[PDB]
Amino acid sequence: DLSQCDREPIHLLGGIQSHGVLLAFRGPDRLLEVVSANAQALLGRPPETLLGQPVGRVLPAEVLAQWEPLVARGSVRVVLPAGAYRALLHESDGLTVLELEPAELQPGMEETALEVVRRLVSPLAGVKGTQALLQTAADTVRALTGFDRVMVYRFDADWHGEVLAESKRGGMDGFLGMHFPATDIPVQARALYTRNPLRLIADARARPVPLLPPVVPALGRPLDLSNSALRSVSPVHLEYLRNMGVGASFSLSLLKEGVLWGLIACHHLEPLHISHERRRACEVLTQLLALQLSAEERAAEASEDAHRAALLGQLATAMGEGGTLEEVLEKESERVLALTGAAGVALLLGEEPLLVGCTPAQDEVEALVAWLATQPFQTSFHTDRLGTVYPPLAARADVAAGILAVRLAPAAARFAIWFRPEVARTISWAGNPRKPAEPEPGHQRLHPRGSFQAWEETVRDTSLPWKRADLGAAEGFRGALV
Amino acid sequence: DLSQCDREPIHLLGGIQSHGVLLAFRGPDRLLEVVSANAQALLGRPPETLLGQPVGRVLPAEVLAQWEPLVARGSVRVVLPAGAYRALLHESDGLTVLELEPAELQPGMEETALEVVRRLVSPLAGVKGTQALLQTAADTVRALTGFDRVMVYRFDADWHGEVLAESKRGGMDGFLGMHFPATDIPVQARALYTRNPLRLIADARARPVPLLPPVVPALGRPLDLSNSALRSVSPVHLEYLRNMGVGASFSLSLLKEGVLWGLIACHHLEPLHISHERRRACEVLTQLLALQLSAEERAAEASEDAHRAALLGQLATAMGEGGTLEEVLEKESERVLALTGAAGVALLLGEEPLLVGCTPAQDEVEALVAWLATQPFQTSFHTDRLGTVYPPLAARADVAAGILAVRLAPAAARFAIWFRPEVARTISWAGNPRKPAEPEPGHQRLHPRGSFQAWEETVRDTSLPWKRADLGAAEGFRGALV
Ligand SMILES: C=CC1=C(C)/C(=C/c2[nH]c(/C=C3N=C(/C=C4\NC(=O)[C@@H](C)\C4=C/C)C(C)=C\3CCC(=O)O)c(CCC(=O)O)c2C)NC1=O
Numbered sequence: 001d002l003s004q005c006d007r008e009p010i011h012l013l014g015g016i017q018s019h020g021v022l023l024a025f026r027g028p029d030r031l032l033e034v035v036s037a038n039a040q041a042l043l044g045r046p047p048e049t050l051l052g053q054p055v056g057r058v059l060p061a062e063v064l065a066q067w068e069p070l071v072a073r074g075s076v077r078v079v080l081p082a083g084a085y086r087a088l089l090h091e092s093d094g095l096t097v098l099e100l101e102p103a104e105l106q107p108g109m110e111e112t113a114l115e116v117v118r119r120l121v122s123p124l125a126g127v128k129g130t131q132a133l134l135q136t137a138a139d140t141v142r143a144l145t146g147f148d149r150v151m152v153y154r155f156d157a158d159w160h161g162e163v164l165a166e167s168k169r170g171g172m173d174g175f176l177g178m179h180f181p182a183t184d185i186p187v188q189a190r191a192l193y194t195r196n197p198l199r200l201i202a203d204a205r206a207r208p209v210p211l212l213p214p215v216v217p218a219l220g221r222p223l224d225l226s227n228s229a230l231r232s233v234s235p236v237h238l239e240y241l242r243n244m245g246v247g248a249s250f251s252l253s254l255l256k257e258g259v260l261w262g263l264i265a266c267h268h269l270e271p272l273h274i275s276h277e278r279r280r281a282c283e284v285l286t287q288l289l290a291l292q293l294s295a296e297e298r299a300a301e302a303s304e305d306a307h308r309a310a311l312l313g314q315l316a317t318a319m320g321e322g323g324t325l326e327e328v329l330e331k332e333s334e335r336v337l338a339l340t341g342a343a344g345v346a347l348l349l350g351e352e353p354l355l356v357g358c359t360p361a362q363d364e365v366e367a368l369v370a371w372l373a374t375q376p377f378q379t380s381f382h383t384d385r386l387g388t389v390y391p392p393l394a395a396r397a398d399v400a401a402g403i404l405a406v407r408l409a410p411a412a413a414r415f416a417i418w419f420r421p422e423v424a425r426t427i428s429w430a431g432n433p434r435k436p437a438e439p440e441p442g443h444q445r446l447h448p449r450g451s452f453q454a455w456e457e458t459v460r461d462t463s464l465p466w467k468r469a470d471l472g473a474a475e476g477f478r479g480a481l482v
Numbered sequence: 483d484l485s486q487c488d489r490e491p492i493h494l495l496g497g498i499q500s501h502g503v504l505l506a507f508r509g510p511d512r513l514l515e516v517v518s519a520n521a522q523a524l525l526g527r528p529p530e531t532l533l534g535q536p537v538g539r540v541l542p543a544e545v546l547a548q549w550e551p552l553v554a555r556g557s558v559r560v561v562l563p564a565g566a567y568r569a570l571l572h573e574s575d576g577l578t579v580l581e582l583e584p585a586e587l588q589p590g591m592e593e594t595a596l597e598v599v600r601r602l603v604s605p606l607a608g609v610k611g612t613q614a615l616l617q618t619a620a621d622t623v624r625a626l627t628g629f630d631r632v633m634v635y636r637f638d639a640d641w642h643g644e645v646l647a648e649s650k651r652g653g654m655d656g657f658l659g660m661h662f663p664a665t666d667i668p669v670q671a672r673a674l675y676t677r678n679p680l681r682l683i684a685d686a687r688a689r690p691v692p693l694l695p696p697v698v699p700a701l702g703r704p705l706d707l708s709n710s711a712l713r714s715v716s717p718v719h720l721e722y723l724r725n726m727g728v729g730a731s732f733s734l735s736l737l738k739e740g741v742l743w744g745l746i747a748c749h750h751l752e753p754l755h756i757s758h759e760r761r762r763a764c765e766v767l768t769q770l771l772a773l774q775l776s777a778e779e780r781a782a783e784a785s786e787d788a789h790r791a792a793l794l795g796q797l798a799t800a801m802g803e804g805g806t807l808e809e810v811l812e813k814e815s816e817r818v819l820a821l822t823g824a825a826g827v828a829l830l831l832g833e834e835p836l837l838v839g840c841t842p843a844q845d846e847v848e849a850l851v852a853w854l855a856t857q858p859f860q861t862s863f864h865t866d867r868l869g870t871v872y873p874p875l876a877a878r879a880d881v882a883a884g885i886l887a888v889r890l891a892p893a894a895a896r897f898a899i900w901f902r903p904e905v906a907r908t909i910s911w912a913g914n915p916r917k918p919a920e921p922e923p924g925h926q927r928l929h930p931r932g933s934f935q936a937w938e939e940t941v942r943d944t945s946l947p948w949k950r951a952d953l954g955a956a957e958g959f960r961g962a963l964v
């Protein structure tokens with residue numbers, strides 16, 4: 001892809017986080033083939049001496065005693081001399097990968113998790129606004145994790161994001177309302193986070209633990225850690241966290257109708273480990289937030305659609321109360337404009353355009369119609385930034401930043417064209433977006449930016465976006481005009 | 483008809499179930515005001531001798547010690563010699579009402595509850611039909627409760643209901659697909675179940691335990707048990723369960739947008755107690771089902787709306803591509819009828835009615851219009867059983883079991899009328915619905931029916947119901963016809 005940021009193979013860095021141990025076994029005899037360099041933390045022997053040994057000569061008796069539930073369930077609690085660990089199995093590169101990390105210490109964790117689930121599944125949840133839904137999600141994740149700061153981050157259409165909601169303990173700074181470049185979470189990270197929806201960085205200053213040997217011998221590259229809970233993340237991102245002053249990080253993918261919509265991101269000022277089962281409990285909260293957001297958005301669409309049909313019916317009542325079409329459309333100007341949330345409309349019904357509300361002048365409308373008659377758009381054309389495609393109205397964002405045009409005739413230049421002004425938007429970037437990274441001379445090592453201080457820009461010349469309900473209303477009104 | 487079934491004051495029967503104890507306290511000194519007759523085994527004293535005594539001389543110290551979180555949270559777990567008990571606190575009739583029942587004994591209950599929550603909130607759980615959502619809810623509630631039979635029961639428009647999905651042990655009979663009279667769950671029960679969304683009948687054969695005294699002395703009537711977990715239910719319902727062969731019963735209200743949509747009903751062949759904590763975990767599943775159903779229904783409405791707008795746009799194009807109306811609408815008959823999912827349409831424009839698709843004859847249409855012209859409706863009229871409200875077409879259920887009519891003029895008999903045939907429906911009732919109860923002579927004591935065996939009827943002369951999207955499409959087409 002575009003950036004050098006996009007090229008780092010984050011699933012092939014060959015490192016795990018220091019609080020866990022990884023062992024990968026090969027074949028029907030379960031021979032140890034890859035092992036983390038710290039594995040004496042649970043094995044007792046130098047890990048290199050155990051490569052090639054079958055699982056029964058490698059793992060502690062306590063783990064072997066749980067082998068059947070581990071294999072059949074993929075996850076089991078094991079009590080080791082170091083304490084309670086969660087053992088996790090997955091498959092990668094033709095190997096069975098066993099990961100061990102400290103297990104949840106609170107027996108009541110799941111009881112607590114169900115209580116916070118009740119907040120997000122509550123009878124009629126989000127009846128205060130979808131902002132209230134986002135805030136409850138941040139608050140419940142903060143309550144369940146104990147992280148200092150929890151943020152709801154939504155990706156915009158160009159893959160840059162903004163913090164929509166924040167929950168944090170007193171005295172903490174935050175990022176509420178701030179925008180971050182698309183390169184802060186590059187394309188291969190977004191792809192990984194669509195498939196693996198959770199990631200914990202327990203200690204942002206800890207050094208990674210390498211795997212032994214550094215390649216899977218059959219493949220000649222490091223073991224694929226895509227599905228590994230212990231994977232050590234990109235060094236550039238660890239520097240980014242350090243530049244933010246963050247000691248530990250935990251994020252969850254928000255997958256809404258199958259696409260990566262955003263993240264819940266959590267920051268702690270000191271190292272902090274969250275158990276596997278507690279991370280999975282937080283995942284339930286994020287899935288519930290996605291479902292609540294979907295329910296509310298679809299309900300909003302249904303309500304908007306009903307309003308559009310009601311307007312079409314009110315306009316039909318007004319027609320045939322007497323008078324010509326032009327008289328009725330002028331008398332019912334507010335209803336005609338409300339069909340598409342517009343500030344003006346031009347109707348080309350055979351003669352000069354009938355201008356209702358705020359439109360460009362007759363000459364400019366006539367020129368736009370002659371241009372529209374050449375473009376290929378079936379029945380409807382819409383844009384929220386007319387000036388980028390139609391330079392004659394680029395300076396007229398006061399009345400024509402966006403248009404929605406519908407055809408009223410197969411070949412003839414007969415149209416209804418609704419108009420919208422620009423909506424200026426002042427946004428605060430977390431750091432200068434013109435300098436989204438600090439590469440070294442030669443552009444070969446790359447570092448994150450050092451500053452996240454607010455940097456203000458105002459976006460101009462773009463209207464509110466045309467909504468699905470606006471487009472349907474316009475198609476429905478074509479029949480009254482044809 | 484508010485019948486005898488509806489008048490039983492089920493919140494004032496003055497009894498609790500035998501597996502718990504109830505105590506109600508009055509005033510700043512928390513004097514014992516009401517106590518269940520079985521309370522001696524947990525009070526060490528015969529309960530009547532403790533009325534009027536302060537809570538410190540009534541309750542064991544183990545209860546009073548968590549009084550604060552009990553008042554704060556409404557529920558705590560208390561460990562007594564007889565075992566672990568759940569204490570529940572609510573307010574009724576100016577009294578503080580304390581209930582004690584056996585506590586959950588499985589340490590992993592909530593862990594199991596989260597796992598079934600994941601199945602029901604899977605990344606788009608119910609990805610091939612809401613029927614799959616209903617089955618998953620039945621299956622997960624059965625897994626969590628251990629009840630022999632779990633059914634999803636939906637209330638229809640007349641408050642009779644039907645079993646839409648079922649999960650049951652092998653060898654059980656069931657009620658899948660069967661319909662039950664509205665009087666099976668009478669009006670005051672439905673009202674109570676909208677406010678208190680869970681109820682357990684742990685032993686359908688056990689006798690009620692009376693409260694002492696039999697009235698709240700200040701009020702002269704029994705304590706209001708509307709919000710009591712231990713409330714003994716209507717004796718007629720206990721007889722109903724007996725006649726069904728059911729030994730224990732647990733139901734949860736499905737509240738979808740503030741309205742009682744249905745129930746999840748659970749039956750066991752023998753007595754069975756489900757802890758309060760486990761019931762509330764099942765409540766999460768039922769709230770999640772309601773949320774999933776709402777999300778899917780709203781998404782379906784949005785999709786159907788888009789199809790109607792597309793059809794209106796396609797008709798407008800067809801109208802502009804040349805020809806008389808009579809020619810275009812005949813040629814586009816499929817699309818015009820699809821606007822409202824109809825099988826025919828009559829247009830009362832200028833001359834004789836224009837009939838497209840399957841309609842009554844011209845004379846029957848002109849008989850129908852004059853009847854419509856005197857009916858009170860703003861711009862649209864619709865019914866799915868024309869024959870009841872308009873007998874002249876009761877014989878034309880082949881083409882006109884339902885109609886959707888819209889006005890095309892303020893004065894004058896000008897309409898568009900879409901027509902639908904009947905959809906015959908063969909339904910199985912659980913018992914003869916003409917004999918929904920067995921009253922004793924004098925009609926003063928009622929008993930439930932004795933048989934739930936399938937009793938088949940075929941419902942005729944009713945069309946499919948007219949959908950919100952059909953009404954919106956009809957309103958949107960009015961503009962094209964005026
Ligand atoms: C409040 C706003 C906010 C934002 C906007 C935010 C960003 C964020 N980035 C990441 C991850 C990564 N970033 C980069 C690369 C680069 N980052 C840059 O700045 C440039 C220099 C660059 C390359 C040229 C890579 C390769 C990864 C993948 C790491 C891996 O999985 O291996 C994560 C997930 C991890 C986590 O939860 O901590 C988050 C949540 N975290 C916040 O709280």
Ligand SMILES: C=CC1=C(C)/C(=C/c2[nH]c(/C=C3N=C(/C=C4\NC(=O)[C@@H](C)\C4=C/C)C(C)=C\3CCC(=O)O)c(CCC(=O)O)c2C)NC1=O
Nearest residue numbers: 487492657662666671715716719731732733747919929930
């Ligand atoms: C598969 C289908 C299916 C159905 C359709 C079904 C019905 C059902 N009824 C009830 C409750 C009550 N019924 C009646 C009265 C009458 N019942 C009759 O037949 C006539 C004679 C009559 C009066 C003339 C009253 C007063 C109550 C309130 C009890 C209380 O709360 O005190 C409940 C909730 C309790 C529970 O989950 O077990 C359910 C679930 N249970 C199933 O499984």
